[PDB]
Structure formats: C-alpha cells, structure tokens
Amino acid sequence: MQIFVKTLTGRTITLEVEPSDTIENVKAKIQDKEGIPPDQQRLIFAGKQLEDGRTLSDYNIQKESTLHLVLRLRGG
Amino acid sequence: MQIFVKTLTGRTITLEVEPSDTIENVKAKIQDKEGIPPDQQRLIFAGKQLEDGRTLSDYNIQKESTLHLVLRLRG
C-alpha cells in the first residue's frame, strides 16, 4: 500500500509499504529511496514518535496515511 | 571558526568551517559528519537559500552564526 512521508517544510514523497512492515523496515525504504541513513530518521504519526520494532498496523497507519520525517543529526 | 546548523525541530550541531568554504564544501562536511547526501541538503541563512558555488564570507556568515538545514527529498 501507499503512504506519504512529509517534512516540516511540506516536502513530500510516497512509499510502498505493507501493513506488517516495521518502522525499522520503513526507515530502510526511505534510505533506499532518498539516501538518508535510518539512524538519522525520526518518524512521527499522529503527533507521536514511532518505535523501530513496531509495525505500521500497530500505529493504525493505513493506505494514504501521512507520516512526518525529521532529522536526528545523530552524528553530532 | 564554528557555526551552528539547526533543524526545524531545534536539533542543533556545530560545524568547524572557514569563511572561504563554499556552500558545496559545507554540505560535503555535513555529509561527512551525518551521512546526509548533499543533494538532500537545503541550507538557509537569514531567509536565503544558499547556493553551492558561493562562500560563507560571500553570504556574510560569521563566527557563531546559525543557519538552517532542511530536507529536499528529491533523491
């Protein structure tokens, strides 16, 4: 299914995902598509930060839902 | 000299730079430190989108000043 991933300035991309995909999985897909390392990514749905080990369906993320992506700048 | 690079969540890092560094050079340093491809980096100082061919002193970016890093999400 298709979901949207959005930045705080409104920039948007689309991802192909499965309901059982983990957030870890989703970050790997963003890396594949955009070249952003998974440990630089923080994903947000319904104003809450998503945990790597949980699935899309765990968070009731559905087709055409929108997630927000922000940078961790984890390299410091 | 050091400058700050800040995101729209407030996440802020410090970068060691020179006035003569080009914006391209700075994005390379960000790629070096954070693993973010330069093509994903939009840098903004005093309301302006920074262009790769110009230098920090070119934009009057001085010691201890802050610029913003925002994602492009192109590729």
Residues in chain B: 75
Residue type for A29, please? Answer: K
Range of the domain at B40: 1-75
Which chain A positions have a beta carbon within 8 Å of B5's beta carbon?
73
Do B8 and B67 meet the contact criterion of CB atoms below 8 Å apart?
no
Do B53 and B38 meet the contact criterion of CB atoms below 8 Å apart?
no
Structural domain total, chain A? 1
> How far off is chain B from A9, nearest CA to CA, in Å?
8
List all residues 6 or more positions away from A69 whose beta carbon is below 8 Å from its beta carbon.
A5, A6, A7, A30, A41, A42, A43, A44, B71, B73
Q: Tokens 């009057």, residue?
A: B60
Helix, strand or coil, per DSSP, at residue B6: strand
What secondary structure letter does DSSP report for B7? -
Q: Across the strands, what pairs with B15?
A: B3
Residue type for B16, please? Answer: E
